[PDB]
Amino acid sequence: AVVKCKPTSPGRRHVVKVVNPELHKGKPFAPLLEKNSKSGGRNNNGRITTRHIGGGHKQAYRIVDFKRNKDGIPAVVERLEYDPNRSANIALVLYKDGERRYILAPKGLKAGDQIQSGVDAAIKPGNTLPMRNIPVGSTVHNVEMKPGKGGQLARSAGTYVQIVARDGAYVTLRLRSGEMRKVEADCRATLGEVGNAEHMLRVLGKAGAARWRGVRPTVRGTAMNPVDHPHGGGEGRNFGKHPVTPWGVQTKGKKTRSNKRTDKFIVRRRS
Amino acid sequence: MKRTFQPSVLKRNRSHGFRARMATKNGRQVLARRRAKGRARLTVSK
RNA sequence: AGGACCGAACCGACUAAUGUUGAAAAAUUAGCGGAUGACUUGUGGCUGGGGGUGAAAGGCCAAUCAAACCGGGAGAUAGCU
RNA sequence: GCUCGCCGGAAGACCAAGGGUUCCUGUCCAACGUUAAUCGGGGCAGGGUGAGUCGACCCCUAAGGCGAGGCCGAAAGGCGUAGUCGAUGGGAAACAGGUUAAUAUUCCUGUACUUGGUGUUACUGCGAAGGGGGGACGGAGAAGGCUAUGUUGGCCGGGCGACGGUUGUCCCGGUUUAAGCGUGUAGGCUGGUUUUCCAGGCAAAUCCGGAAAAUCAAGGCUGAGGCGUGAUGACGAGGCACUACGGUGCUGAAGCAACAAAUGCCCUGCUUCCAGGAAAAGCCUCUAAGCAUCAGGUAACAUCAAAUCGUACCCCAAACCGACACAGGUGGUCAGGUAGAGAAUACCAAGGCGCUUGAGAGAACUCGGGUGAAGGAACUAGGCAAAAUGGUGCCGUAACUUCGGGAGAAGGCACGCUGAUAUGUAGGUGAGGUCCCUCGCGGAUGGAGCUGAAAUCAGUCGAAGAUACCAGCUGGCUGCAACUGUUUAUUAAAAACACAGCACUGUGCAAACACGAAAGUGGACGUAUACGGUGUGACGCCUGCCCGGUGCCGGAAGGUUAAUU
RNA sequence: AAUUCCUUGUCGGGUAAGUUCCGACCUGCACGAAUGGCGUAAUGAUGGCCAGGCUGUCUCCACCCGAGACUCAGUGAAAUU
């Protein structure tokens, strides 16, 4: 749960952390590991395209079944392992046929529950089945926009999506950002919500905690010099412009979505 | 104090060697220019 | 346990004196700060100039930088000495 | 040659990188060496570097490079699949002693080990560009056994002291040995065996995984260290003979025990924490096609083979980087004694040095220091500088407070040596015997020896007992920044930047954005609890009012309005 | 106030004597609310002020110890003109 650390040191005064006792301790399943090198924000041209990225603790990638197409065979969850790659915990399932896989951890799941995937699977938190079958009005997660493409939306910890209507071959969902979006009705999804919901309440406390995760410091525009950034320099503290990006695009209000191809699927833009 | 030239034969060969120069056509142009000028040593080597 | 304390190696340069034709084209001497970390170091690799990088001083990019070095336009032009 | 002084977690020894004969011998002082120079890293001549086990080479691979085909681009070309390269990482094996002026895990002696080939022999399921296993991996913390090593006591060989004593609880020296081989210990890890099935591991599998039974309560894996062997060997203080006076030839006793103990080993171990900690090959196993007497595999024996390149010298400096024989810089390895917490510090050991101009004299003045009557900041922009405090144990310690702190606040007390407590106590260490058995590197007892803080009391010396070195000035009011941190290499380290936190804002994934004439790449193998941009910058109380101006957002069919017609 | 020209504003504290310091008045030339307002424990090689100890900073310098400066032998520059 959420725990505060007492102020023994200034770098420790404001530290608040979430500790889960149930998470398994020990090395993860080796056959599901693979190397993952960090880039530092530089593309194949060796040029920095994204800023504030670099350093951080070394990490290894873990293979997660975002498709869940292995239907007809039940499985038992063994443990809830910790994933440094993402924000949500990952459960290690074993199918009745001895095949081991990793999945996102739904809320309310403990070691021992049954799991089933398929068109005829039972309605319970975690089961996977296309919206041809889910009753209208429920909460799911790990949804996809194209069949067989794998889970694509609402994958961060603590999030979900709410289904509101099925019209013919298209259903309508209310995304976490508030958008009302159409989607093809033969896409599969997982019922329930993603676990580790209290991920919000952590407080980093000190800059070293952020740096452990590989994020470089950000330099304010208003203190810069004129030659590099439009917000420019000047004596004292002078701003006297309208806020703008480093490349000259005005911020604080300007829309940027210009994809006329997929505008047919949006029913209501977020408000 | 620590100053500019810190010798390293491997770096020297890989940055100014015969093969490194000739890998691209600019290096070929440099080699041709040195040959025309008639320099004693075309590039750094043993 | 601690971006916890005192303090060697290690890193840095706050004060004073000398030196400034210097043992040195930025030292030395006596003090000084950090010293399990946002730490420091070896080797190799990548980022090329109106560009790179920059916890951001117009700082660094081979003793140089409000636009590097070499070669060329080029015997630029000079109502000035 | 004798004496003196200095360094000695170095100014000692060995490498890496880098340099290339600077290494040794003979020979000369033309030029170089900040003076002489018979000397030299100088000049000339000659000599010197020996590898199946050490590195390179070689098998594999990360960051990354190149890249058939391919995509894209006026041309030149950019990116990338198959693939190939690329260590700073993974992969087999030699020890001790002796010799040159210059080489030595390379030459010699003795004792080893690894890999591959060939043949003989006996048995015989062999087979991969495929599947499994393993290789194969974070930080911090703790403590039991060890070892290096040192000290002491014995042992052996010497000695009786230039000046008071100095046959003994006196002084000096030594009291050493590897790899491999067997032993499998302290200790760590894991139940084992058999049978029967199975939508999985691209097919296949007896292999892995999963399921169901029966059976046993030990059974494997790992493992420092110790003992034996190696080793009747070598070495060995010395002594003996020549000293072509450098060295050479012989010979050569004792060669034990206790205690202490590493940052090294067990330990790639154990506990614990979140920031969740390379890859591939060698090695073991499964089968696919194929081959079956074969072929091939297995085990023993004998035999052959293990190519090439580097091996001199300096390597915290006179040889490297700095125009210099330059007070500067340069990664790793080993780490004695005394006191001490210490790799600090002062004096020494092994070892290495006195820094390539000297000799006189004792003006002003300058530089680095020592002391100083009385005053004690009166100096000055400013206590700049200098002066001053400084250790261990114990007692005692305010306001404020985010209850953590402040705080080592402040402040005070004891500190040497000798005797006794106690002929060396507490404590630690621990054999011989005794018994039992698992007869083993076994178990209980048992205390010999060995080592040994701290404290009390009594006495005693000095002016001075934390005597040297080493080793915080303290308090009060107050502006700024919450704090650790970063910055103008080379006049500015800060009230500047950053930071955790807060707010707005854009982005529904082929995301926004950014580098690219383009393919493409980052974002991100992430999916609104996420990502980008801007503003402020812990925490607490808060964050009035104004939409006229300028921007941004939502609508215009009212007006004006382009290419076209 | 790191604001404030007039201004060394006025009063109080501190000193024998205080344009600096602290606490108030308010007539804010020309503060003010996320280019943030007010306060804040702890922290700072940070700015300002005041005490005790300490002393050659000073009153006012005196003596001594070493390296130069002087002499002799040897080698043997430079700026400028």
Residue numbers in the entry:
A (entry chain BD): 2 to 272
B (entry chain BN): 1 to 46
Sentences from the paper on this structure:
Significantly, we find that the ribosome increases the speed of transcription at the expense of decreased fidelity by exerting mechanical force on the RNAP and by allosterically inducing an active anti-swiveled conformation of the enzyme. Our work shows that the coupling of translation to transcription prevents prolonged stalling of RNAP at the expense of transcription fidelity through a combination of force and allostery in vitro.
Initially, the consensus TTC reconstruction revealed an ill-defined density for RNAP, indicative of a heterogeneous orientation relative to the well-defined ribosomal density, suggesting that the ribosome might have translated to different positions on the RNA. After discarding the set of TTC particles with the RNAP distant from the ribosome via multi-body refinement, we were left with a sizable population of particles (around 20%), from which we obtained a TTC reconstruction with highly reduced variability in the position of the RNAP. The geometry of the RNAP in this map represents the most probable state, which occupies a ‘central’ position on top of the ribosome 30S subunit. In this structure, the RNAP β-flap, αI-NTD and β′-zinc binding domain (β′-ZBD) are located close to the ribosomal proteins uS3, uS10, and uS4, respectively. In this present TTC structure, the position and interactions of the RNAP with the ribosome resembles the ‘expressomes’ or ‘collided TTCs’ previously described.
